[PDB]
């Protein structure tokens, strides 16, 4: 494919926008990749690894309540606490959940818009799929900033979300 690569890591695979490359950059314990954008490094995609006790991702309750359980993933977080501060993420809202079963093994697929408190109002789209095999969490994190994703970054990081597919 010419817009995208196919990436097969260690028991998952994934398409990747062409134009993107591999940054070392680790943000989680248990990451095992990421890709960005040469231009903007908030458009990207992560893979991370972790070892569980549950056997299916609908284990860990919702997805409203998986996320609360793995909202590390968005970034350090202010909770507009009474005061007399920095770019953390201040808003966070599921635009979109939904728990598709392919090829046999149950995923969830969640589309959520971060906002960092007062500053530049920088907006994030941050989309994840999920899944749970082998002992395995796998996760898949998608995502661009407002400029991107309203000039052309859209369809690539929605695809490498949507294209996540654990063996």
């Known amino acids: 494919n010419t817009d995208f690569i196919s990436y097969v890591g260690d028991g998952f695979k994934l398409l990747i926008p062409s134009k993107w490359n591999p ?14 954008d040469n231009f903007d490094a908030n458009s990207n995609v992560s893979v991370i690894i972790q070892p569980t006790s549950k056997k299916a991702i609908t284990e860990y309750g919702s997805p409203e309540e998986f996320l609360s359980q793995v909202d590390y993933l968005l970034g350090k977080q202010a909770y507009g606490g009474k005061t007399d501060e920095t ?16 090829d046999g093994k149950q995923y969830y697929s969640i589309t959520v818009l971060t906002r960092t408190a007062d500053g530049d109002e920088g907006g994030k789209h941050q989309l994840i799929t999920a899944t749970v095999s082998d002992g395995k969490l796998y996760i898949c994190k998608a995502q661009a900033g407002d400029k991107r994703w309203f000039k052309g970054a859209r369809k690539g990081v929605e695809k490498a979300a949507a294209s996540f597919s654990v063996a």
Not at 23 to 36: A, D, I, N, T, W
Not at 90 to 100: I, R, Y
């Open 23 to 36: 940054s070392k950059e680790r943000e989680f314990p248990g990451q095992v990749l990421r890709y960005e």
């Open 87 to 102: 770019d953390a993420v201040a808003t966070a809202n599921v635009l979109e959940s939904s728990t598709p079963v392919v």
